[PDB]
Amino acid sequence: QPVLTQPPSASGSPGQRVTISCSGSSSNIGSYTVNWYQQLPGTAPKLLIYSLNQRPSGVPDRFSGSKSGTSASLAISGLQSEDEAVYYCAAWDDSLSAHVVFGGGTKLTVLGQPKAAPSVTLFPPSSEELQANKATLVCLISDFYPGAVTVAWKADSSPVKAGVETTTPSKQSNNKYAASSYLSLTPEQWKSHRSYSCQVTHEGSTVEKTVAPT
Amino acid sequence: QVQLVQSGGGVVQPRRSLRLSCAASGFTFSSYAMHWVRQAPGKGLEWVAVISYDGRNKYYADSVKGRFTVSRDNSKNTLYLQMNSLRAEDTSVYYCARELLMDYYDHIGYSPGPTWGQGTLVTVSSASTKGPSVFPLAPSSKSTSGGTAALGCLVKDYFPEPVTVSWNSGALTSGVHTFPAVLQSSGLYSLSSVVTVPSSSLGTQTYICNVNHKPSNTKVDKRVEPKS
């Protein structure tokens, strides 16, 4: 509940309807109204929907809000290219430690070119770095569209979360997207496993690359 | 026109302070509750605080309780955020926003309304000028597919941005991709630059990454070759 739950991303083609969900609990969405905000790159958020279903002037009537129980939903009829943005829901929460609670945001892509799976290159630690008593795995992720991926690392077959730093996808010059993820290990950790993998998930498909000690 | 204008952002160290202000015009500021909301680079919105119209009631995000204080001066149509006891994770763009309705109701609570400022960036960091360590990312069978090999340079642990990378002093540009940097928990940046080249050249052609970090007046030229 510290963050209302929204899907990280969504997409649709021009003309389609899309819906974006926002899940909370009885102390927020169950008891208080939900607002939605639209944010374009490098600009402040804009109020899109207030009091669950009302639009400020200057907001197209293809945007609408609804609520049922502890979930709320933003619907966009007839997607247009300018609807590509990040959408946030928010509600007052009257728990102990009352506060405004935002959802985590949903990046909506309005599809304007073909889906493109990421190219992934994974480099192991260099011998020079290992001699500095450090070890960095480098997972480079490029040429994907839409611009949303999740990255998961494995030591052998087990999830690794510690020591991971991943960038937020950024547009390339060709309007596809790039990101990178770095796994920091000790030299000992690196040599004590048979392999490490970087798995990139994009629009439901996974691309995995694996490296092993020399 | 109806607007809010934030000021006061800048670069500061942790365990220090910074004071933000937000100057309202074109609406009756003194009749509205006011919010602060923040957003870390590449991340989501996070509510920081709200203050009632008369300043009598304040509420805060748990993470800033004991550290930040919201206040207002209605005579000056100004909202303040006094950010004491700064921490690195307070790095964000800070927005002020007007409450939705003029008065307070039971089924509404508080929520950011239609008027938002432009944001002011606060960067909290204890890092200081440092040039990068550069490591080769050697080409290998595993970075080779379809007559093209990938190789690169890892530019590690520098501050502040930016770094520039060229290959072979500009003689290699096709297939070069220098990725945006990651900001590590340490407060230092790292990035990688990768080039795709015909596998055919890995013997004859020399590959040198040229790394320039102007902020520290550091320049590194590193040859990247197949392992041994």
Author numbering:
A (entry chain L): 1 to 9, 11 to 27, 27A, 27B, 28 to 95, 95A, 95B, 95C, ...
B (entry chain H): 1 to 52, 52A, 53 to 82, 82A, 82B, 82C, 83 to 100, 100A, ...
List sentences from the manuscript:
The hemagglutinin (HA) protein of influenza viruses binds to sialic acid receptors on host cells and is the major target of neutralizing antibodies. In a previous study, we described five naturally occurring human mAbs that potently inhibit the 1918 H1N1 pandemic influenza virus. One notable difference between these two antibodies, however, is that mAb 1F1 not only inhibits the 1918 H1N1 virus, but also 1943 as well as select 1947 and 1977 human H1N1 viruses. A greater understanding of the basis for such broadly cross-reactive antibodies may suggest novel vaccine or therapeutic approaches to influenza virus infection. This study provides a detailed characterization of one such antibody, 1F1, and highlights common, emerging properties of cross-reactive anti-head antibodies.
We also determined crystal structures of the 1F1 Fab and “avianized” 1918 HA (SC1918 D190E D225G; AV1918) components separately at high resolution (1.45 Å and 1.80 Å resolution, respectively). The availability of these high-resolution models for molecular replacement and as restraints in structure refinement significantly improved the final quality of the lower resolution Fab-HA complex structure. Indeed, the Fab elbow angles vary over 30° between the 1F1 Fabs resolved in the free Fab structure (215° and 217°) and in the SC1918 complex (185° and 190°).
